[PDB]
Symmetry: C3
Subunit: 161 residues, 3 copies
């Protein structure tokens, strides 16, 4: 079977005005709060990993890396992504292309998108043209608009090698 589709969706709640600031798409972004989570809280990498595992019918991140397991407290999401991708390659698939939509009232994602694409293209061993990332606001509506957290949605295509 030639191609497979995958979808990922992930949310994190902000901490308080201590938090050690954002990592999104492997990029450290300046901000007054960070996202609370078992690992580094990288919403964009989580959504992307799930899209990949989902396309491969491998479940999701929780399947591969139990949230219960203390070996992943503060785990680097880029490492989790690379491991999942390794498994996807093992199963005979490689990335066709990926598209990510970050949903956050703030901070601005646009300055960091090029580096995010760099990190992803590295991690998924492909050309940067196979990675798209956008960011969008929720016009101050709902919990993202209220600034209580950031959500991220990802969509992916795997090609059979």
């Amino acid at each position: 079977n030639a191609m497979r589709i995958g979808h990922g969706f992930d949310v994190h709640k902000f901490g308080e005005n201590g938090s050690g600031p954002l990592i999104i798409g492997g990029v450290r972004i300046p901000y007054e709060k960070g996202l609370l989570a078992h690992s580094d809280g990288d919403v964009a990498l989580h959504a992307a990993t799930d899209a990949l595992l989902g396309a491969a019918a491998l479940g999701d991140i929780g399947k591969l890396f139990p949230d219960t397991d203390p070996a992943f407290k503060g785990a680097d999401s880029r490492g989790l992504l690379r491991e999942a991708y390794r498994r996807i390659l093992a199963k005979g698939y490689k990335l066709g292309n990926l598209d990510i939509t970050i949903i956050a009232q703030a901070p601005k994602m646009a300055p960091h998108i090029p580096q995010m694409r760099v990190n992803l293209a590295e991690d998924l061993q492909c050309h940067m043209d196979d990675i798209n990332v956008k960011a969008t606001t929720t016009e101050q509506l709902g919990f993202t608009g209220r600034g209580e957290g950031i959500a991220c949605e990802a969509v992916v295509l795997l090609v059979n090698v």
Copy 2:
């Protein structure tokens, strides 16, 4: 045209502490409330049906099965899915693969995912490897995090027969 993409999204509000407990992905899940709806309220099957009808440019579930029509009060969502799939086959398409993301603060979906995949693979007459299901929390943010309802998002690929 070789392949077609489809997306589905569906939400249901919980009832009170009577409700007759969850059906999700055709699986009856133990819980203090059920989801109010015209049919059985199976959010995951609704999202999946819409993804399929959407890929086929057949509209959505409301198009095929009027919500107004009393013949579908408490309708089995698996039956609705099978009917839609019948129509998709009629139009010359079959499932490539499906991926589903349930968004619910509770109860835990993970124990039921294998059976959900069984029901879907049966319904869409395919191998279980063409079905992925994940569940995710919203970290207690928004109406799902607040426990007022469950949302579900589905993505699908149809292949031309």
Copy 3:
């Protein structure tokens, strides 16, 4: 590379009981409020444009048409869509198919869907069978259910010409 996937997501907040009523999918829909936005606020066309640009790894609408730029105040979203599609064709891709899910408590989208599909098929120079549009409610949950805005989600497939 044969096919590319894209995802779009967009939200707009309603104005007050002046607002000059809805445009969605290029269709003017009767309503007591309109959606506030820099351009015409057409959530469905925005989500679709982003899905297209995202599949093409061209970023999103903000990339092509700065929100800062006064040349796009009240810009027609259909025009923005046509420009983006022009760029996608330039890059060697054409629409495979598109699917859109409008998320709105009200007004009813169903009466307008056929015209929306007409506008899109015109804009993306394809057959209406390559366009699907659905609408869904959020059962009065969250900010859409509360009627403070409308959200829209789009998914797309590009084929290499």
